[PDB]
Write a protein that binds this ligand. Sequence first.
Ligand SMILES: Nc1ncnc2c1ncn2[C@@H]1O[C@H](COP(=O)(O)OP(=O)(O)OP(=O)(O)O)[C@@H](O)[C@H]1O
Ligand SMILES: Nc1nc2c(ncn2[C@@H]2O[C@H](COP(=O)(O)O)[C@@H](O)[C@H]2O)c(=O)[nH]1
Ligand SMILES: [Mn+2]
Length: 1095
Amino acid sequence: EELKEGIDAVYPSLVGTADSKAEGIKNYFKLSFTLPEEQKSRTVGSEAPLKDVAQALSSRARYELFTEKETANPAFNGEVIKRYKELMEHGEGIADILRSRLAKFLNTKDVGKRFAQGTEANRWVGGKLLNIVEQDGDTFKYNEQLLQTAVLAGLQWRLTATSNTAIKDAKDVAAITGIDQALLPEGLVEQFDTGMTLTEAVSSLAQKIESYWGLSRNPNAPLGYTKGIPTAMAAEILAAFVESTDVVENIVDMSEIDPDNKKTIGLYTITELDSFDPINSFPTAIEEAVLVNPTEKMFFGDDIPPVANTQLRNPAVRNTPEQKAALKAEQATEFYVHTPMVQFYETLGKDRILELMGAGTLNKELLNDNHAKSLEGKNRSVEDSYNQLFSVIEQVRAQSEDISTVPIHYAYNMTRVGRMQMLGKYNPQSAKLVREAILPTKATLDLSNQNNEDFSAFQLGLAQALDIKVHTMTREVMSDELTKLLEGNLKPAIDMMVEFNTTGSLPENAVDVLNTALGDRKSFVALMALMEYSRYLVAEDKSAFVTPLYVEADGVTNGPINAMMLMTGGLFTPDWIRNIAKGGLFIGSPNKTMNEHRSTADNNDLYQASTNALMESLGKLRSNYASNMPIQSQIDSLLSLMDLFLPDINLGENGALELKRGIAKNPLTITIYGSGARGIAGKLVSSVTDAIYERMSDVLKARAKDPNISAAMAMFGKQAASEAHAEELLARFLKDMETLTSTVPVKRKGVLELQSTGTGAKGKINPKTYTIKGEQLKALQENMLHFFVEPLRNGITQTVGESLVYSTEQLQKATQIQSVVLEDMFKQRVQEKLAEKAKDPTWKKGDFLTQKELNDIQASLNNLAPMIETGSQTFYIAGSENAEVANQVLATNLDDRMRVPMSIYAPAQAGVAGIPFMTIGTGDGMMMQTLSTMKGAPKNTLKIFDGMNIGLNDITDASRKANEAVYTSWQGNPIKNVYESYAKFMKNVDFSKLSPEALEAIGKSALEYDQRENATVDDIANAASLIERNLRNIALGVDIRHKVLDKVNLSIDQMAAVGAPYQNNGKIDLSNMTPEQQADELNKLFREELEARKQ
DNA sequence: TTCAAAAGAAGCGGAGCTTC
Ligand SMILES: Nc1ncnc2c1ncn2[C@@H]1O[C@H](COP(=O)(O)OP(=O)(O)OP(=O)(O)O)[C@@H](O)[C@H]1O
Ligand SMILES: Nc1nc2c(ncn2[C@@H]2O[C@H](COP(=O)(O)O)[C@@H](O)[C@H]2O)c(=O)[nH]1
Ligand SMILES: [Mn+2]
C-alpha cells in the first residue's frame, strides 16, 4: 500500500484511479511504476524540470550545487554554458510542439470529450499518453514534470544518439528491406546505415525517457503499459523532432528498388550539429545533471567505468566471474592522446584527410553513378571518425594543460559471442583513425644504437605499420626490408614529416607526397609510422625516445585454426598436422616461431592452401566437361572477367591460372560458420561489379581529359601496354559480360547444364549510368556459384578437414533443434497465458503479459538447458528480442503513425549461429579473456578480438602470454559443452507438444531429405537423440586429442609477429619426425588413452 | 540460413485487416 500512495503523492493529479479492478478510467502509469528505494533521477518531484535543469546548467556553481558535486567537468565552461542555454530554449520549443499535438489529438474525433465520459482511450495503442495527462477544465493537459523530463531525454538523445547506433551491414539491410542480400543496389546499404529505422529510433529514445523518469517498473503490470507509455512518449518526441527538423524523416519505397516489394520503410536521421559547435566538447551535461549514475560520459583519470552485470543485450545471461574480471582489467587500462598525430590530423585538415584516406571531393560527373555512391559512404566513415576524434580531443583538452597526460578509460561489455567490445561507435578498438590518436601503449626506448633490442622492436612496429608482413619473416630479414623502404620510396614522405616535426607546417602538396610514397601501403597506422620515424630522426635524446608505436600480435587465420583445434574429433591425420602448423601449432620443434615456419618450412598459410585446393577442384571440374566446349568457354569467361578486375586472380600468357590467398579469406571463414555457397558467390560478384563500376569512372575521367581517346584505351589504358593490346581486353570484357549474363549453369541431377536467360546484357555502355542489375546480377551470380565457389568449398573442406565439417554440422543441428523447441514452447506458454487473460475483466487485449509472467515462462524452459556453460563463459544461442511473440503494436504517435511493434526478449531459432557463437566464443573470446586475467596478464594493451596491440617495451613477454592464452583456450571443448546441454534437453523435451511448424523445422536438421515429408513425432524424437550420441562421441575424441597433444612437445605461435612462441614442455619428444610418423605416435597415445577410460 | 542487435507504412477505429 505504501508504493501505491507513494507514487500517488508525486503524481496526485493524473487522470483515473490507480486500481486495475476500478470501474471508470484507470491510471496505468501509477499502476505500472513505483518510486525507487534509491534516487535514480534528480527531476523526480521537480515541478518544472526544464526550468530547473536550465537553471542548473546556467553556471558552474549552480551545476555543482544541483549535482551535489564539489567540482564539475572543466569542459563545462563559458562557451559551452551558452550553447546549453540555447539548447534549453529549444527544449521549450519541443515541449510546446508536444502540447499542441496533444490538443490536436484530444480534439480530433472528439477523443477528449469521449475520454472525459469514460471511454477507455488511455488503453488504445495511440492513447497511452492519456495516462500522463491531467484534467484542465473541459479538456486535458500533460503532467508538466513527466513531459518536461521526457523532453530533457529527447535533448540528450538528440545530442549523442547518433554516436551510439549499431553499424548495419548487407545482412541487416536485407532483413530490414526484405530484399535478397546478393541483389542489394549500390549504396542502399549506405543509405540505411546512415539512418535509424523507426524501431531503432524509438527504442533508444524510450530507454532514455524511462531512465530520466527515474521510476521502477511494477513486476505485476502489463508490458503494454510499462513498455508502452514510455514508447508512446518517445514516438511523440520523434514526431516533434520531425516538425522541428532536428530529425529528418525519409519513407523509403522498395517498390522502385524492386517492383514486387510492397514494403515502405521509414528512415530517421538526426540533423548534424556543426563540427565546431562548443556543445560537442561536452555533449553529456544533461545526462550528468539528471541521472545520479550517468551512463553517457567520458571517463578521465581515476574515474573507472562500472562493470556490466549482464551479457550485452542478453539480460538473461550474467557475465561470469571470469568475464567480469576481464572486463575490469580492460576498463582499468589508461589511454592517452598522442599529441603529434592529433596535430598532424589538424594540420592536414578534415578535407585533406578525406582526400588522403577517403574519396576526396566528388566530381559527380567524372564518376559512375554506383561508384559515386560507394565513395560517399567512404567519406562518411572517415569524416565521422575525424569529427568524433576532435570532439573527444576538445573535452580532453579542458581537463588539463597537457592533453597527453590525461588518462582516458573506456567502458567494455561482453557480447553474445564472448568478445570484449569497447562501447561506442568511434573508439580505439573500432576506428582506425582514432586508434592512432588515442593509445594505451607507450614505451621509453633506447634508440641511440640501431643494434639495440629496443631499436629492433621499433623496427618491427614500423614495418608492420608500413604493411610489411612481419610474421612471415625473421626479425633480421624484416629489418633489412624496412631499411630498404625507409631509404627508398618513403624518404620523400619521411623528409616532409621531419620538417613537420621541426616547424609544424606541411607543404600544400602533402597529400600528393604521402599518397605517392605509401602507394597501397597507405593507412592510418602507416601515417603513425611515418610520424614516429620522423620524430625519432629529430629526437634530442634518442636514448630515451617516448612513443606509443605498437606491434600487434595478430592471430594467423584465427577462427579456422581455432575451429580445427577445438572441434576436430577423430584420430590425427598427417594433413591436419601440416595444416594446423600453418596456424602456429608446431609439433616436435622446440622454440619454433611462425616467422621461421613461413620462411623455411611452408610459405603457404591456410588461405593459400585452400586456394591451391580450389585450383585442383577447378581442374577436376574441367575434366568432367572436357568435351563440352560451351561449358569450357563459360568457365574461361568467368575466370577472364575476374582476371580483368580482381587482383587476386591472374591469368597467364598461355591461359595459366594463378590465385592469391586473398579470394579465399572471407569464403573460408564464413563457410565454416555456416554460410551458404550462394551468399559467397554474391560477395565475389559484388567485388567484381565494384571494380567494374570504378573502371567506368576511369573512363568518364580519362575521356573528358581527352575526347579523342578510344573506348578500349579509356577503360583498359592504365591496365594495358599498347593500343590493340587494350582492344582485346575490351573484347574480352564485352564477350565475358554477354556470355555470363545470357547463359547460366543449372544443376540438373548431378550434372551441370547451360541454360539461356533471355535477359543477357545488350547495349552500348554509358560509363555514368552503367549498372549491372537484377537478372544480370543473378546470372553473374549463378556462374560464380557453380564454376568458382563450389570448387572453392571443396577445396575448403579438403583443407580444414571433413572431420571438422562433420563436427560443425552436428553442432549446428543440435543448437538449431534446441532453439526451435525453446522458441515454440515459449510462444505456446505465452498463448496459454493470454487465453487465461480473456477470463480477466481487468485485462484488455493489448496489455500483454507482466514481466513476472514472462519471467515464469522463461524459467519453465530451464529444464531444456537454454544456456551453454563452459565454466568461464555462458552462451545463450537462442536468445533474442523479437516481434513475433506478441505480434502486435506497442504504441503509435498521436497521428496514428510511427507504429512500434511490441518486442519481447525471447528465444528464437539459431539457424547456423551455433557454429560461430561457439567458435568465436571459445576460440578468440576465451584467449582474450584469458589474456586479461591470467597470471602476469599483459598491461597497457588494446585487444581487438584476435589481435593485441602491444607497447614496444613488452612485445616479447606479452606475445608469449598471448600464445599461452591460445594454448589455454585450446584446452576447451565446445562440443562437450553443447553436448552437456543437449543431453539435458533430450531428457526433458516432449516433441509431441510442438506445433507442426516446429516439427518440420526440426525435421530439416534431424532428418534426411526423404524421411522428412511425413515422418512421425517418434521419427523426429529418435533422430534428435541420434545427434546427441554423435555429439558425445565427438566430445570424447576432442578431449582425448587435447590430452594426447599435451603429452607431446609443442611450440605455439598462433599470435604471430614478434616471434615469441609458447612452449608447453611436453615430455614426449616428436622432433625429427615426419607428420606421418607424428600422427602414428599421437594415434598410439590416443588409443592407449582411449583404453585408460574404457577400463 | 555466416556471427557480433531488432527493424514496413498508414486509413479506419479503438484491433487488426487491408492495400500499397
Ligand atoms: N566476416 C566475418 N564473419 C565471421 N567471422 C569473422 C568475419 N571476419 C572475421 N571474423 C572472425 O574474426 C577472426 C579474425 O579475423 P581477421 O580479420 O584477423 O582474419 P583471420 O581470419 O585472423 O585471418 P588473417 O588474420 O590471417 O588475415 C576470424 O578468424 C574470424 O573468426
Ligand atoms: N565476427 C566478426 N568479426 C569481425 C568481422 N569483421 C571484423 N571482425 C573482427 O575485427 C577485426 C578487424 O579489426 P580492424 O579491421 O578494425 O583492424 C578482425 O580481425 C576480427 O577479429 C566480422 O564480420 N565478424
Ligand atoms: Mn588475425
